[PDB]
Ligand binder design. Structure first.
Ligand code: INN
Ligand code: ZN
Length: 253
């Protein structure tokens, strides 16, 4: 490992929904929540030996927190990830998750080009229990801005993005649950795909420590494996880190 290039610096964005419901309309409350969540997530990453030996000490740190206090004013037919209304169906509490991640990536493009990753934190009840989404580890994108020309957007967007919602089934999720959502989404950004049932080593039974963080079904941080990366995730992420740390990782602050 290169200690000068072992940290993925993040642009963290709190939308108006997050500011109102998680921040309780306060900047200090909003930032403290995020600083603490990223730091606990960083502990999981930093302590992971990607090759099961000495390839450890890789993590994440916040470079900047953008705090959107109020909804983004939009012109008719114009959409923005921070607008007041949900898209495509305004009658719903939440956006369609895939459309939201695409919109966030479009709006944050200039800022995303300058950071290892951009992450959106929101407060909306995505349909059917979805908690987040991210580019990378899909069956392109993830760590280090990779341009994608959007035919719809008519401009380059960067695929170094992800999002976390702390609202699910009409309530705020536990902090131990939110930590796991962000760890999983950043896991995709770091190159990991979902752990498959077909590989017992990567998807253990409840009496064998339970599921790892990359399992497609949400885990409550009460089982032994829930806050850890599987050997499947480690193999995928090890390859990403090897290829990507020299490109955009920085020295730990
Ligand atoms: C932190 C979790 C692992 C992220 C995944 C989505 C995902 O893979 N994002 O990258 C999820 O939201 N999963 C939901 C999940 O497991 N949500 C739980 C909290 C839930 O609501 N379960 C109820 C089952 N009807 C699904 C979409 C599978 C329902
Ligand atoms: Zn996933």
């Amino acid at each position: 490992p290169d200690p000068m290039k072992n940290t993925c610096k993040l642009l963290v964005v709190a939308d108006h929904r997050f500011y109102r419901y998680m921040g309780r309309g306060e900047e200090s409350t909003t930032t403290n929540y995020l600083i603490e969540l990223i730091d606990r997530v960083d502990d999981i990453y930093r302590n992971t030996a990607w090759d099961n030996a000495g390839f450890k000490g890789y993590g994440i740190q916040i470079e900047q927190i953008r705090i959107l206090k109020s909804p983004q004013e939009v012109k008719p037919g114009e959409k923005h990830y921070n607008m007041a209304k949900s898209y495509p169906n305004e009658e719903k509490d939440a956006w369609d998750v895939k459309m939201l991640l695409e919109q966030f990536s479009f709006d944050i493009a200039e800022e995303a080009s300058k950071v290892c990753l951009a992450h959106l934190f929101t407060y909306q009840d995505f349909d059917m229990g979805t908690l987040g989404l991210a580019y990378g580890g899909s069956p392109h994108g993830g760590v280090c801005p990779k341009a994608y020309y959007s035919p719809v957007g008519k401009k380059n967007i960067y695929l170094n993005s992800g999002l976390t919602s702390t609202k699910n089934y009409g309530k705020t999720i536990l902090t131990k649950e939110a930590d796991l959502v962000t760890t999983h989404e950043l896991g995709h950004n770091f190159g990991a795909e979902h752990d498959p049932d077909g590989l017992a080593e990567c998807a253990p039974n409840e009496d064998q420590g339970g599921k790892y963080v990359m399992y497609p079904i949400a885990v409550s941080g009460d089982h032994e494996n829930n806050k850890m990366f599987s050997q499947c995730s480690k193999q995928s992420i090890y390859k990403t880190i090897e290829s990507k740390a020299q490109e955009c990782f920085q020295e730990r602050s």
